Amino acid sequence: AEAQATRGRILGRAAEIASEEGLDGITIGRLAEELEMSKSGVHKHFGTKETLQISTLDKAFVDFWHRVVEPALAEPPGLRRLRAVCANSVGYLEEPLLPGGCLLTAALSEYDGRPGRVRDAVAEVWSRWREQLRADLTAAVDKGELPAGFDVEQALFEIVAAGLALNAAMQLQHDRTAADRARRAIERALAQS
Amino acid sequence: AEAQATRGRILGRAAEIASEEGLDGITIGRLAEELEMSKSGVHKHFGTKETLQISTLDKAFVDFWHRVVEPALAEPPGLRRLRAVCANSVGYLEEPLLPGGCLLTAALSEYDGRPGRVRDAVAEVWSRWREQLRADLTAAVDKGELPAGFDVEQALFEIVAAGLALNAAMQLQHDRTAADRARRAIERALAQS
Ligand SMILES: [Ca+2]
Ligand SMILES: [Ca+2]
Numbered sequence: 001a002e003a004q005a006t007r008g009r010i011l012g013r014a015a016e017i018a019s020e021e022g023l024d025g026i027t028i029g030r031l032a033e034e035l036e037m038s039k040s041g042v043h044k045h046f047g048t049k050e051t052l053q054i055s056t057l058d059k060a061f062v063d064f065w066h067r068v069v070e071p072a073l074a075e076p077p078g079l080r081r082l083r084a085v086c087a088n089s090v091g092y093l094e095e096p097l098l099p100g101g102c103l104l105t106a107a108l109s110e111y112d113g114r115p116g117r118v119r120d121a122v123a124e125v126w127s128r129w130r131e132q133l134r135a136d137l138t139a140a141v142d143k144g145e146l147p148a149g150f151d152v153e154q155a156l157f158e159i160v161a162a163g164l165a166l167n168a169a170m171q172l173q174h175d176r177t178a179a180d181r182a183r184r185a186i187e188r189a190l191a192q193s
Numbered sequence: 194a195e196a197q198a199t200r201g202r203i204l205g206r207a208a209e210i211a212s213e214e215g216l217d218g219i220t221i222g223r224l225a226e227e228l229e230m231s232k233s234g235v236h237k238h239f240g241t242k243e244t245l246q247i248s249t250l251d252k253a254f255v256d257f258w259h260r261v262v263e264p265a266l267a268e269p270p271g272l273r274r275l276r277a278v279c280a281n282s283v284g285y286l287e288e289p290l291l292p293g294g295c296l297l298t299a300a301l302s303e304y305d306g307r308p309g310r311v312r313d314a315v316a317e318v319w320s321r322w323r324e325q326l327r328a329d330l331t332a333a334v335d336k337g338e339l340p341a342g343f344d345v346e347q348a349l350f351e352i353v354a355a356g357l358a359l360n361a362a363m364q365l366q367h368d369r370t371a372a373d374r375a376r377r378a379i380e381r382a383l384a385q386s
Contacts (some may be wrong), residue, residue, distance in 0.1 A: 003328065004366075005220060019306065020306030020307065021307075022244070022303070023217070087210065099306070100305070100306035101305070101306070105302070106302050106306075108216070108303075108361055108365060109298070109299050109302035109303065109361070109364075110302065110303070110304075111365075112293070112294070112361070112364035112365040113212065113213030113293035113294070113364060114213065114214075115212070119365075122365070123263040123365060123366070126365070153370075153374065154374055154377055154378070157355075157358060157362075157374040157375075157378060158354075158358075158374075158378050158381070159353070159357075160358055161351075161354035161355050161357060161358035161378065162350075162351075162354050164354060164357040164358055164361065165350060165351075165353055165354035165357055166283070167300055168302070168305070168357065169350075171302075171305035171306060171315060172301060172305040172312075172319070173230075173303075173316070174313070181346065181347055181351075182350075184347055185347070185351050185354065188351070188381070188385065188386070192381065193381070
């Protein structure tokens with residue numbers, strides 16, 4: 001079952017490629033060529049390019065979650081966990097796992113005008129991410145760490161916005177100042193949203 | 194010189210197509226087929242697909258500027274002009290000229306990992322937009338409408354971030370609540386950044 005290793009090789013290379021070229025740059029044939037494999041050998045892991053595209057998206061999300069959310073679980077729900085998650089996500093955006101930055105953020109713009117199975121998977125991922133942030137904001141109000149009338153969705157909007165702007169600045173401008181601005185924007189989100 | 198009209202037809206259809214498919218979905222052959230023209234007839238306006246791609250980006254930016262910035266010039270520089278520009282840009286994002294939303298925002302994610310002439314043009318456009326916002330923030334401090342130690346680049350970061358998040362929410366989620374959140378995020382940007 002060194003298949004599991006081969007699968008990881010495929011998905012790993014696909015995430016790298018897709019982070020700069022887009023998910024639609026991902027075909028069975030492209031990956032066979034990149035890894036000096038037969039198309040047959042790729043096809044036994046992933047039947048269609050859409051399956052490969054979705055599995056690559058999922059893999060990248062798993063790697064992100066392991067770097068960003070899992071380390072934060074050593075903190076209690078609420079502001080403690082939220083601050084940890086946000087510090088980790090900023091870190092991940094300023095030093096991405098993939099050469100083209102955050103694949104989740106890029107897939108968002110690539111697929112929002114592309115109705116179908118891949119876009120539905122992008123929506124699913126973004127939904128889980130937003131919920132992880134929202135749960136800790138909600139917990140923080142519940143625990144009295146934020147005021148009773150605090151607007152959870154406003155703060156969430158602004159926190160996600162900071163991430164999107166950080167990724168754009170890093171990828172387009174190589175602007176390393178954006179991270180400190182994202183950090184400040186996240187604190188400001190917590191102060192009256 | 195009904196060529197000028199033909200050019201507008203080409204660029205118009207190209208902006209529509211690119212807003213959902215990306216700028217890399219733009220070829221001479223695609224547009225010839227879309228408009229029932231010869232490739233020859235397209236090629237006399239735009240020699241290469243990169244020229245066509247850049248001209249389409251520019252056209253879309255011109256249309257945006259005419260809807261968003263020009264109407265705001267009836268206001269004095271500073272907060273008056275800034276609020277008008279931001280209200281217009283929010284309006285444009287909730288009711289876009291193109292079916293796939295803001296082309297400038299999409300090109301940003303499409304081309305940041307694609308070094309070359311198109312990406313350089315995307316950078317140029319985004320630079321002009323950021324400067325239009327920055328000039329009015331700077332004017333507002335200069336006029337004493339914002340406090341003396343107000344951080345112009347923080348506010349700018351957060352204002353641009355709100356636009357990026359609004360476009361993502363509109364395009365992916367059809368979430369019409371995002372506009373009111375963008376509006377609130379822009380006011381909050383002006384309050385201590
Ligand atoms: Ca929940
Ligand atoms: Ca200037």
